[PDB]
Symmetry: D3
Subunit: 137 residues, 6 copies
C-alpha cells in the first residue's frame, strides 16, 4: 500500500498532457488512489515550498505553480515512490532520458511538466497538504 504524490504542473495541463501522463501510470499497473483538478493558492504554494522560503528561486516557483490549474493525484503500488521518480526522469529535461515523462514531453527546467514525491515522508507531507482525508480512496 505504499503511495506517492504527483502533480501535473500548469504547463502539463495547458499542453493537454493529463491523459497521456495518467495513461503511462495506468499501463504501468499503479493504482489511482486520489485525483483532482485544482488551483493552488499563493499561501498554499508558499507552504508546499516552505523550505525554500529563503531560496532566490522561491518567488519563481510559487508564481509558476499558481499560474494555472494543476492535476494532483496519489498513486499506489510496490516501490511506487522511487518508481514514479524513475518514470518522470531527471528534474531538468535536458538530463532526463527518452522514455521518461520529462524526457519525452519537456525541454525546460522551469516548465518540467510534472512533479513526484522525493521520499515517503515528502509524499505524506504533500498528500496531507493537497488532499482532504475523504479524497483518498
Amino acid at each position: 500500500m505504499e503511495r506517492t504524490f504527483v502533480m501535473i504542473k500548469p504547463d502539463g495541463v495547458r499542453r493537454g498532457l493529463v491523459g497521456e501522463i495518467l495513461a503511462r501510470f495506468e499501463r504501468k499497473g499503479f493504482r489511482i488512489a486520489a485525483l483532482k483538478l485544482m488551483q493552488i493558492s499563493q499561501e498554499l504554494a508558499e507552504r508546499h515550498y516552505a523550505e525554500h522560503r529563503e531560496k532566490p528561486f522561491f518567488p519563481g516557483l510559487v508564481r509558476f505553480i499558481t499560474s494555472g490549474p494543476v492535476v494532483a493525484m496519489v498513486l499506489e503500488g510496490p516501490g511506487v515512490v522511487a518508481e514514479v521518480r524513475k518514470m518522470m526522469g531527471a528534474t531538468h529535461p535536458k538530463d532526463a532520458l527518452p522514455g521518461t515523462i520529462r524526457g519525452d514531453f519537456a525541454t525546460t527546467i522551469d516548465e518540467n511538466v510534472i512533479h513526484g514525491s522525493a521520499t515517503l515522508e515528502d509524499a505524506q507531507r504533500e498528500i496531507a497538504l493537497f488532499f482532504r482525508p475523504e479524497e483518498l480512496l
Copy 2:
C-alpha cells in the same frame, strides 16, 4: 463557455482507461474545467438515477455505479455537450461505432464505461449534483 458532465464509470476506472479517455478529450480541444476520483454514495447514485427508481433494474444499476470509484469531470468548449455525446457513441456498445469511446472500449450495456450529459439542462443538473461550486475552474 458551454459545459458538460462526464463520468468514467467504475469499469472504465477499473480497466485503466481513465488516461486514454481523458487524452481523447484533450486532443479534441476541450478544456478540463473540473476533475476528480470519487466514490459515489448510495444517496448520490439515487439522486442521479432517480429517473429509474421504479424500474426493476434500478437496484443493480445503483449497485454497479457504486461498486468502485469513478472519475467525474467537466468539459468546456464549443458545443461540448453534443460533441461529447457523439464521441462516446451509442449507449448500447452494440450500436456504437468504432473510433467512438464505447465502440472501442465497451462490450455490454451494463458496463458501458462512460456517461456524458444528454442535454444542456442535464449538464447543469448533473454538474451541480456531482460538483461543489468551488471545484469548477
Copy 3:
C-alpha cells in the same frame, strides 16, 4: 461463450499490423481463446474459399491468401461475432469508415488486411477448419 474466427491476412502480417490489430480487440474487452502464425496450405485455402471455386477470381484469391504467413485467432466475448464484424469495417476498404480496421489500414479490396467470421455458423465452421480442438483455450 460466443466465439468468432479472425484472420490477419498476409498483407496485414507483412505490414507489421498484427500487434496493433490485436491490441484493438484486447482494448475492446474480448478474450484471445486461440492464436497462431501459420502458412495457409493450398488445400486449406480451397476448403475455406470453396464458395468461390467457380468464380474467375478464385485462382488469385487463393494465391494471395497463401502468399505469406497469416495470423489466425479466436475471439471470445458478448456478441463477439457481430462486434468484430463492425470493428473490421466493410469488406471493400472504400466503404469502411475511419476508426474501423479496414478503414484505417486497408486501401484495396484484394488486400483488405483482415477477415472475421460472418455469422455464428461461419464461426464454428471456420474455427474447426483452422484450429485443432486442443488449440482452443
Copy 4:
C-alpha cells in the same frame, strides 16, 4: 497513380498535430509524393479561395489561412482522393464522426485543422498551385 492535395492548416500545425495526422495516412498505406512547411502568401491564399472572394467571410478566411505556417503535401494511392476525403470527416467538425481527423481533432468550422482536395479536378489544380513540378516525387 492517383494524387490528392492535403493541407494541415495553421491551427493543426500550431497544435502539434502534423505528425499524428501524417502517421494516419502512412498507416492507411498512402505514399507521400510531396511535403513541405510553408507560409501561405496573401496572393496564394486568394488564388486558392478565389471561389469565395465575394462572400463576406473571405477576409477572415484568408487572414486565418496565413496566420501561421502550414504543411502542404501530396498523397498518392488507390482512390486516394475520395479516401482522404472520408478520413478527414465532414468540413464542420460537428458533423464529423469519431475516428475521423476533424472528428478527433477539430472543434469549430473556422479552424477545421485540415483540407483535402474535393475531386480529381481540384486535386490537379491545387497541386499545381501549391507545388512546383520539381517538388513532386
Copy 5:
C-alpha cells in the same frame, strides 16, 4: 537469420498486453517467425525450469507460468537475442528503465510480464521445447 524465444507470461496476457508488446517488436523491424497461444503443462513447466529444479523459488515459477495461458513466439533479426533482452529491460521491473517493456508495464518481479532467451543456446533449447518444427515459418 538469428532468432530468439519470447513468452508473454500469464499476467501479460490477462492484462491485455499481447498486442502492444507485439507492436513494439514489429515497429522495431523484427520478424515474427513463430507465434501461438498456449497453456503450459506442469511437466513442461518443470522442464523449461529444469536447472532450477533444486532452487527454492522453483515451485513458485511452475505455479505462476502455468497459472494461465501464455503467448509464445520467435523473433528473427540482427542481434535479436541481445536486442530483445535490452528491449525487455531488467528482470526486476524496479531496475528496468522507462522505455523497456518491463519498465513501462510491470511493477513486480513475480509478474514481470515477459521473458526472452538469455543466449542463443537458451533460445534453441526453448524454441525446441515450445514449438514443433512445422510451427516455425
Copy 6:
C-alpha cells in the same frame, strides 16, 4: 532560437515512420522551422559527406542516402541539438536505448532510420546545404 537539422532517411520513409517520428518531436515541444520531402542528388550527397570522401564506406553512404526520397527538417528549441541527438539514440541501433528513435525503430547501422546534427556548426552547414533561405520559417 537554437536549431538543428534532422533527416529521416530513405528507410525511415519507406517504412512509414515519418509521422511517428515528427510526433515525438512535437509532443517534446520543439518547433518545426523547416520541413520538406526531397530526393538527394549524387553530387549533393557527396557534398554532405564531403569529409568522408576518402573513407571506404563513403560510396555506401551516398548510395543509400540517395536510394530514395528523404524528409529534411529543422527543429528549434532549448538545447535542441544535444537534445535531438539524445532522442535519436546511439548511431548504431544495437547500442541505442529503448525509448530513443533508433532504439525503438531500427536494427542495423546501415539503415538507422534517422540523422541529426552533431554540433551547431554541423547544423548550419547542413541547413544551408538542404534548405533555401526562404524555406526556413
